[PDB]
Structure 1
């Protein structure tokens, strides 16, 4: 039984684990704490890029955005390298997804615009996809820091899986924009030790990770079987029991993903 295995992992890693895989043609939903709230951490950047693509014509990807020293406030591997030239919206989407660049995500939120530095418009985008659960209230670094249990900047494995399903598998985006989002997540560099590690090499995996304080580690993916059957996999975790400086444990997500892969193979 899956739930027993997930509970064993919780004890092993002194963690709380949430998992959701939506029902398909022949499988019921897989769900473990799937309606409990977990911090978004950086996972919000995937639907953020979808919001920015949806909102604008494609030539918008070519708009140059400039920024300065005081815009660099969070882990930002790419944005730090280009501060002297600026970055296009396309480059910022690339960096936000593939390197989880925090400054890029902040600039993309500002591009969306409106109250709360774009957080309200981001939430509005989720509402338009039928997600009445998730909320973004702050930008980086603040959004990764809410105390355990706090509802600010949270989603649920259930809600975010259904969002990602509509973005990648459904018709939320036109095919040209859908393909851009799909490709960036396909080329993600931060996810090798999470959902990807739990699925065999002949399964295709696209994903977006998140990491925070209190041992927070998430990964949201779309996976395809070797025969092209897709499944959406949302895994979220925290380790409140070690306090603010509890280490995130990637291996917990790899093992949860291995357990899901075993059921889906």
Structure 2
């Protein structure tokens, strides 16, 4: 069975694994440590973009945000190409999702406003979606570095899956904003070795990854069958017993995803 296969992956990769796939018409829910807390890492950037989209009219996409090279304190492949000009909200959303730009995310958090550089507003947005578990407390890059056991900057597989389903498959965003979020995730550059690697190539996969210290590696995705049937997949992991410098294990997520895909085909 699934639970035993997942436990074997935990043993093999010296990791703690969390998995949630919501029920659908034809499929049972899949759940493994689904209510245990794991650090968000950059998986938060998907609902962050949704919050920014939701709170303003579409035209807010062309608002110019300025920032200095001192504001770059994390790997920011796009933001560090545009210090003199600034970047529009639309470009920041693109960068935040597709290259997991950390400065882009921090600027988007500031665009939400309020205390904690926007982290309270972001947590507020998740509450407004019926997510009562998740929370964000720090900015990038600190939110990837909390010690094991600390509930700051955490979510659960269950919670994050239901948020992603609302954003992409439900009605949390109107169709024009929704299509933007969906397209950015569809053209993600960072996820090929995770959920993508465990689903056959004829299935469509959109996703957002997360990676951090203590061997943290996540991926949250929406997948479609070759015949267009959708599923939501949240996979989370850490290797915290190996310390701050424990390497993330991308193959764990690809193998967990392969188990999920096998079950969903039957």
- TM bucket by the smaller chain? over 0.9
Matching residue of 2:195: 195
**Can you list the C-alpha shifts for 1:175-223, whole angstroms capped at 9, x where unaligned?**
0000000000000000000000000000000000000000000000000
CA shift, 1:69, in A, is: 1.6
CA shift, 1:93, in A, is: 0.1
CA shift, 1:134, in A, is: 0.2
**Can you list the C-alpha shifts for 1:205-248, whole angstroms capped at 9, x where unaligned?**
00000000000000000000011110000000000121000000
CA shift, 1:72, in A, is: 0.3
Cα distance in 2 for partners of 1:68, 1:41 equals 24
Structure 2, unpaired ranges of 5+: none
Cα distance in 2 for partners of 1:14, 1:84 equals 45
Q: TM-score, normalised by structure 1?
A: 0.99
Give secondary structure in 2 for the equivalent of 1:140.
coil
Equivalenced residues, count: 265
Give secondary structure in 1 for the equivalent of 2:237.
strand
CA shift, 1:54, in A, is: 0.3
Matching residue of 1:57: 57
**C-alpha RMSD of matched pairs (Å):** 0.5
- Point out the more displaced range, 82-91 or 162-171: 82-91
Give secondary structure in 1 for the equivalent of 2:232.
strand
CA shift, 1:174, in A, is: 0.4
Cα distance in 2 for partners of 1:217, 1:172 equals 27
Give secondary structure in 1 for the equivalent of 2:218.
strand
**Can you list the C-alpha shifts for 1:24-66, whole angstroms capped at 9, x where unaligned?**
0021110000000000000000000000000001111001111
Give secondary structure in 2 for the equivalent of 1:35.
coil
Q: How does 1:12-27 map to 2 (within 5 A)?
A: 12-27=12-27
Cα distance in 2 for partners of 1:242, 1:85 equals 42
Matching residue of 1:222: 222
Cα distance in 1 for partners of 2:129, 2:240 equals 31
Give secondary structure in 1 for the equivalent of 2:27.
coil
CA shift, 1:73, in A, is: 0.6
CA shift, 1:83, in A, is: 1.1
Cα distance in 1 for partners of 2:196, 2:83 equals 32
CA shift, 1:152, in A, is: 0.3
CA shift, 1:23, in A, is: 0.5
- Point out the more displaced range, 65-74 or 92-101: 65-74
Cα distance in 1 for partners of 2:69, 2:81 equals 12
**Can you list the C-alpha shifts for 1:102-122, whole angstroms capped at 9, x where unaligned?**
000000000011011000000
**Can you list the C-alpha shifts for 1:61-110, whole angstroms capped at 9, x where unaligned?**
00111100221011111101111211110000000000000000000000
Cα distance in 2 for partners of 1:76, 1:255 equals 29
**Can you list the C-alpha shifts for 1:135-166, whole angstroms capped at 9, x where unaligned?**
00010011011111110000000000000000
Q: TM-score, normalised by structure 2?
A: 0.99
